[PDB]
Amino acid sequence: HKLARSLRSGPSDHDLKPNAATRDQLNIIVSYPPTKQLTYEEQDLVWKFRYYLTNQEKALTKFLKCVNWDLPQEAKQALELLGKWKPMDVEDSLELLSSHYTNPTVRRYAVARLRQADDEDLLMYLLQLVQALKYENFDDIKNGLEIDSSQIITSPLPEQDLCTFLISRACKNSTLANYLYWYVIVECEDQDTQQRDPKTHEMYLNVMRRFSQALLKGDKSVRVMRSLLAAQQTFVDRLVHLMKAVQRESGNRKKKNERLQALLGDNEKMNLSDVELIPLPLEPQVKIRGIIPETATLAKSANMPAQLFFKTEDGGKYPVLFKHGDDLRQDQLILQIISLMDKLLRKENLDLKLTPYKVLATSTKHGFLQWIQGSVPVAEVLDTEGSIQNFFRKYAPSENGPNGISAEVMDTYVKSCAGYCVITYILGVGDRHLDNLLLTKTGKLFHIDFGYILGRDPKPLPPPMKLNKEMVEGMGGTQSEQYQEFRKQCYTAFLHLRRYSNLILNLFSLMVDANIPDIALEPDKTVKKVQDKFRLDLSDEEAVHYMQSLIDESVHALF
Ligand SMILES: O=c1cc(N2CCOCC2)cc(N2CCC[C@@H]2Cc2ccccc2)[nH]1
């Protein structure tokens, strides 16, 4: 073993081609998932046929682990092969930016591959790419220059690495700028980072101050970007102050609610019912005129979230749920992954009427959730109308539609049930009950409150497919043509998502050092818990018959 890999071959068999039997062994090893550890035998094998593997872009990520970088004999040839290799897809490049690869060239190369991606894709990975800064050169991030984090943006002055790249893209795209601001603010406000990795806490302040510096340095349109972020930041700082002023001022919930409205209605002091048309950080397409004082209510629940109604640019209400005294990041992640999964299925022309509602932490302590206007907890739906079918008949009846319900509504309910069954199965969402399953009168089922994920549950053995009796009776029972449809969607959705397993797993790779509670328990064992739910051991034909039997053994058990 201890004889180095370039000491055992190279480049006198750059002329190698593997035989039929070996080509199978490689293709298995190459398209392994991206935290599946490789054995010394397999790392040796990948090195042996390294000149063959330069025509399989998939394989590049595997090869670079087998390089020993301390040996400059190895490292100089390895990086020569990195230029002769087929360039990898952006989907894959996220792997190179994780904790596992430390070589400057490898990481700059990854950024060059990212720079091929357009901002719509880049946004879907931005949360993870802010985590990826932790594995960057902290000295180089500092040396770009030319402390409360919430004051940086509001206090002006009278080969790209990852940090330089993200800032460059943010100054050219205001959507990225919005989310890059708030993601980095949370990493600064991360207190566990302040304690155990104070050097990392400094890096994110340096990232924020680097960003603000470019915004001020940039042209006329870019400088306005800075003042819009400053507007958001004080608005949130005022909103958080208004929350503290209620959370403290004692009395019951009804006295606190009267209090909440008093402070909102007072715009001289608190300055929240008539903002100057600023962009909502949650979704910056929505500019907000102010919070409506008279509708604002506090939820009868543990951390007292406030239900707030923003009056918008175009005369509408955009309701949100603002939590003070609660970590949102575990939700931020899940909704962010469900957003992708929704988009990946639509890539394949499968719209399953999913509800990936917006979530933005504006600190570790607090943040925003988009309220879906018209949603009701399935519990509440069962409680007042009796069944999921009675609900739909009352609110969307039809002479010819199935069970006296609009066919379009019944279709929506099926598809959403199917998608969320598969998606809550993969992500390992536990602690499901009828208060965290919501229903809409459009037909849409969806899930909220992701306090338990990646296997975790109050129960020791939860069921793997999160599907109850009431849900099945909403279709028409096990013999309806709806339930036939509901299976077909599940196995198809499961199949399509399997074909982006590599992407999803590379994303979860980046989230291990993010202090998300259900990931922090078993960070190394986190990514396998997702990987294993895809059942990559099976073929597509086998995966279908698996997903089928998953759904059947679950539904059989219910009756
Ligand atoms: O984590 C979430 C997300 C919620 N949303 C966001 C998506 O639209 C529906 C409401 C609501 C909640 N909560 C927490 C306090 C109570 C509320 C749950 C709720 C949902 C629907 C009607 C009444 C109450 N939590």
* Secondary structure, 3-state, 136-203: CCHHHHHCCCCCCHHHHCCCCCCCCCHHHHHHHHHHHCHHHHHHHHHHHHHHHCCHHHHHHCHHHHHH
Q: From ligand 1's centre to the CA of 261, what distance in Å?
A: 20
Q: Is 370 helix (H, G, I), strand (E, B) or coil?
A: strand
Centre of ligand 1 to C-alpha 139, Å, is 43
Helices (H) and strands (E) in the chain, counts: 27, 10
> How many angstroms separate the Cα of 229 from the Cα of each of 128, 211, 220, 341, 455?
21, 11, 15, 29, 38
14, 22, 27, 47 from 17: Cα distances, Å: 9, 9, 14, 13
Q: Which amino acid is at 142?
A: K
| Shared domain check, 379 and 360 | no
**Helix, strand, coil shares, percent, the chain, to 5:** 55, 10, 40
Distance of CA 304 to the CA centre of its chain: 25
Taking CA atoms only, the protein residue closest to ligand 1 atom 22 is 376
Q: Does the residue 79 lie in any domain?
A: no
Bridge-based pairing state of the strands 437-439 and 376-377? antiparallel
Shared-domain flag, residues 457 and 516: yes
Residue 439 Cα, ligand 1 centroid: separation in angstroms? 11
Residues 241 and 364 both lie in one domain: yes
Ligand 1 pocket: which of 438, 441, 442 to mutate (most atoms within 8 A of CB): 438
User: Which stretch of DSSP H or E encloses residue 342?
Assistant: helix 329-347
Residue 195 lies in a domain: no
Closest residue by Cα to atom 5, ligand 1, is 371
Other residues' Cβ atoms within 10 Å of the Cβ of residue 288: 22
Closest Cα to atom 16, ligand 1: which residue? 299
Task: Please say whether the beta carbons of 324 and 368 come within 8 A.
Answer: no
Residue 208 zone, left/alpha/beta (φ > 0; ψ -120 to 50; rest): alpha
Gap sites in the chain (C to N > 2.5 Å), preceding residue numbers: 146, 158
**Position in ligand 1 atom list of the atom nearest CA 357:** 7
Query: Are residues 352 and 423 located together in one domain of the fold?
Result: no
366/360 Cα distance (integer angstroms): 9
Report d(CA 340, CA 351) in Å as an integer: 12
Q: What angle do CA 80, 98, 25 make, to 5 degrees?
A: 60
Residues 517 and 404 in one domain: yes
Residue with structure tokens 């020993």? 68
Pick from 500, 471, 491: which is nearest to 547 by CA? 491
Q: Angle at CA 233, nearest 5°, toward 229 and 236?
A: 135
Instruction: Give me the CATH number covering residue 285.
Output: 3.30.1010.10
Which of 369, 398, 419 is a domain's end point? Answer: 369
End-to-end CA distance of the chain: 58
- Parallel, antiparallel or unpaired: strands 366-370 and 317-324: antiparallel
Domain boundary residue, one of 334, 369, 404: 369
Q: What are phi and psi of 543, to 5 degrees?
A: -60, -40
Pocket test for ligand 1, best of 330, 333, 334, 369 (most atoms within 8 A of CB): 369
Residue 43 domain-assigned (yes or no): no
Question: Nearest-CA neighbor of 511 among 37, 92, 125?
Answer: 125
DSSP 399: S
**Which of these, 106, 84, 97, lies nearest to 130 by C-alpha position?**
97
Q: Closest Cα to residue 510, out of 110, 133, 120, 33?
A: 133
Length of the chain: 559
- What gap in Å lies between CA 206 and CA 140, rounded to an integer? 10
44 within some domain: no
Query: Given 315, 350, 369, which residue is the final one in a domain?
Result: 369
CA dist 276 and 297 (Å) reads 23
Indicate which residue's Cα is closest to atom 1 of ligand 1. Answer: 449
Using most ligand atoms within 8 A of CB, pick from 384, 448, 452 the residue to mutate for ligand 1.
Answer: 448
Torsion angle of alpha carbons 252, 253, 258, 261, nearest 10°?
140
Residue 210, in any domain of the structure: no
Asked if residue 336 and residue 265 are part of one domain, the reply reads yes
The verdict on residue 269 lying in a domain is: yes
Residues 521 and 381 in one domain: yes
In a 3-state reduction of DSSP, which class is residue 304?
coil
Q: Please indicate, yes or no, if residue 222 is contained in any of the structural domains.
A: no
Find the domain containing 400 and state its range.
375-557
CATH code for the domain of 424: 1.10.1070.11
| Sequence-distant (≥ 6) Cβ neighbours of residue 499 within 8 angstroms | none
Q: Work out which ligand 1 atom sits closest to the CA atom of 377.
A: 21
Could you tell me which of 156, 155, 106 has the C-alpha nearest to residue 132?
Answer: 106
User: What domain count does the chain have?
Assistant: 2
Under 8 Å between Cβ of 497 and 344: yes
Resolution of the model in angstroms: 3.1
Helices (H), 249-304: 253-265
Output the ligand 1 site: residues, CB below 6 A: 299, 301, 305, 321, 357, 369, 371-372, 375-377, 438, 448-449
Is residue 203 domain-resident? no
Q: Which residues pair with 278 in a beta bridge?
A: 288
**Which residue lies with its CA nearest to atom 7 of ligand 1?**
371
Is residue 397 within 8 Å of 407, Cβ to Cβ? no
Whether residues 363 and 286 share a domain: the answer is yes
Judge whether 466 and 439 are in contact, CB under 8 Å.
Answer: no
* Long-range Cβ pairs for the range 481-489 (8 Å, 24+): 481/402, 482/402, 482/410, 482/414, 485/411, 485/414, 486/414, 486/417, 486/418, 487/548, 487/551, 489/350, 489/352, 489/414, 489/415, 489/418, 489/419
Residue that is written with structure tokens 């989310």 in the block: 179
Q: Left if phi > 0, otherwise alpha if psi is -120 to 50, otherwise beta: which for 290? A: left
Q: Please state, in angstroms and as integers, the Cα–Cα distance from residue 541 to each residue in 147, 226, 345, 349, 531, following that order.
A: 57, 53, 19, 20, 18
Of the CA atoms within 13 Å of residue 176, those in its CB half-sphere come to 22
Q: Specify whether the CB–CB gap between 305 and 328 falls below 8 A.
A: no
Decide: 365 and 324 in contact? Cβ < 8 Å.
yes
Cβ neighbours, 10 Å, residue 188: 23
Check whether residue 392 and residue 330 sit in a common domain.
no
Do 424 and 281 belong to one domain? no
Protein residue whose Cα sits closest to atom 19 of ligand 1: 377
What's the 448 CA to ligand 1 centre distance in angstroms? Answer: 7
Dist CA 274 CA 265 (whole Å): 9
Q: How far is residue 366's CA from residue 186's CA, in Å, rounded to a whole number?
A: 10
Q: Helix or strand or coil: residue 519?
A: helix
Region for 71 from its dihedrals, namely left if φ exceeds 0, alpha if ψ lies in -120 to 50, beta otherwise: beta
- Cα dihedral: 64, 97, 451, 456 (round 10): 10
Please check whether residues 390 and 321 belong to one and the same domain. Answer: no
